[PDB]
Design a binder for this molecule. Structure first.
Ligand SMILES: CCCCCCCCCCCCCCCC(=O)O
Ligand SMILES: CCCCCCCCCCCCCCCC(=O)O
Ligand SMILES: [Fe+3]
Ligand SMILES: [Fe+3]
Ligand SMILES: [Mn+2]
Ligand SMILES: [Mn+2]
Ligand SMILES: [Mn+3]
Ligand SMILES: [Mn+3]
Lengths: 274, 274
């Protein structure tokens, strides 16, 4: 049979229990009114963060497939069962942001303008290259690098900080309750995605403590582009402060920044050398 | 955004609405008692069909990944969203049969003995070869052949006939209520899997009516192994008739056989030349 005690079978079971939410059930009618109420300058304030998320949700939905292939080819059946929940979660994440964009009237609008160079180095290179590599090279090194970029950086550092940022800004304002319900569901799903990456990296590290060094190195290789995108969104936020003024939000970009730094270092600390 | 009117987006929505069942919730306690109550010769009667299903559930969970890859690479986002529900359904199908095997005490038992040559030509060759081909060859021909073997033959002909057979035999007997609840859920999921294959084959046929001929040809190429496995299970059933006698089941293998023939021909008729 299945190995019922396998950590990824247990995570698969939790995913089924905790993954019933449906983006089609979220009421976005108030978000539509909120967005319509905003000034043109308040309207822009929110779009860079939605742009960063929308694109990556689509990217990881497509880019997790090579990991499922590689682990399937290695006969890791429980990992594959769990990854069917991962891929389905990401599909719902694509759906959720696309429903919000449609509801508030920006579906026809092209948000790529808010992807700078550092973003693109992660989104159009580091991520798809590392995942696609697994189709021809499933070595421990390749699998660690894939989980590091996908689960520890894209999800474990950027997404987690993006969820926090969303709450720090719009939950305060009382704005966009449907989007924030969605963000709460995404954040719950993301816990399991990150735990998959931790388990995958740890079980490879457990074979040969020298893989720990590779993990730390790949995290550090990506940090410059993490902070460079974060700096660029900070610059944007500081230059368009009408939403912050209108809604009495002292948006503390220094606290966000230290949260990103904090996310990055705590992901490192969830991998043990021994 | 997503194309909200796309047939596969609509199928994805139905999958979310109709795909909440969880194999971990099925009570198999009575199945355990039923199986324990059976004579050794009654015990064997049921295993060939469970053997055919268990293996194929695992095969399609792994073997649907190349289709998702190929359609993703073609930018068919709605198809991919739907296929996340397909892959997750098949994961639950693997789980369901493995839970039943565990509960009734045959988890440690090796059921490969009930796969004959015709089965293996589908299971170990036609199916994985046709699906894996999509990694390097996503031509209309390759995509039609993949959906024909997977969705129209393995699911649309063999699985559908296997669900019917399960009901024709054990629903009658009053045996194995947990397994039959599972079979009802599998059969509901399978409707969407088959509709994916119909849509995929039809939209390729729509481009060039000559692909219709390829579809019919591939169906006919596989028919000999479909019926050869069906004949071999019929032979098995006729040689071990203690369960049929004990439970007053006049198991009409000729009616099953014509149901298989019927499944095969109606799958053909769900593809239009024009
Ligand atoms: C303004 C302070 C910066 C806060 C950091 C914001 C990061 C934006 C979101 C981009 C990453 C989204 C990744 C999603 C990945 C997934 O869905 O698994
Ligand atoms: C005794 C009459 C013959 C009845 C035919 C029985 C076929 C047995 C089941 C084997 C095919 C299972 C395919 C599952 C595919 C899927 O889960 O999508
Ligand atoms: Fe994720
Ligand atoms: Fe199926
Ligand atoms: Mn820079
Ligand atoms: Mn023969
Ligand atoms: Mn996501
Ligand atoms: Mn199935």
């Amino acid at each position: 049979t299945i190995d019922w005690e396998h950590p990824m079978f247990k995570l698969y079971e939790k995913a089924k229990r905790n993954g019933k939410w449906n983006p089609a059930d979220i009421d976005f009618s108030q978000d539509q009114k909120d967005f319509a109420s905003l000034t043109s300058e308040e309207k822009i304030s929110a779009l860079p963060l939605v742009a960063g998320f929308s694109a990556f949700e689509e990217a990881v939905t497509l880019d997790i497939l090579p990991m499922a292939h590689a682990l399937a080819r290695q006969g890791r059946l429980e990992d594959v069962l769990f990854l069917t929940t991962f891929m389905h979660d990401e599909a719902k994440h694509v759906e959720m942001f696309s429903r919000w964009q449609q509801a508030v009237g920006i579906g026809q609008m092209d948000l790529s303008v808010f992807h700078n160079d550092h973003y693109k180095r992660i989104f159009y290179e580091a991520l798809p290259e590392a995942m696609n590599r697994l189709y021809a090279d499933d070595s421990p090194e390749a699998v660690i690098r894939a989980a590091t970029v996908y689960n520890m950086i894209v999800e474990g550092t950027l997404a987690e900080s993006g969820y926090y940022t969303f709450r720090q800004i719009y939950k305060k304002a009382g704005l966009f309750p449907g989007l924030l319900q969605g963000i709460d569901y995404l954040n719950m799903d993301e816990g399991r995605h990150i735990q998959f990456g931790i388990y995958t990296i740890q079980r490879i590290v457990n074979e040969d403590e020298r893989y720990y060094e590779l993990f730390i190195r790949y995290m550090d290789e990506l940090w410059p582009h993490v902070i460079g995108y974060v700096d660029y969104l900070t610059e944007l936020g500081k230059r368009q402060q009408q939403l912050a003024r209108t809604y009495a939000l002292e948006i503390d970009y220094d606290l966000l920044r230290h949260y990103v730094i904090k996310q990055f270092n705590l992901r490192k600390k969830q991998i043990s050398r021994t």
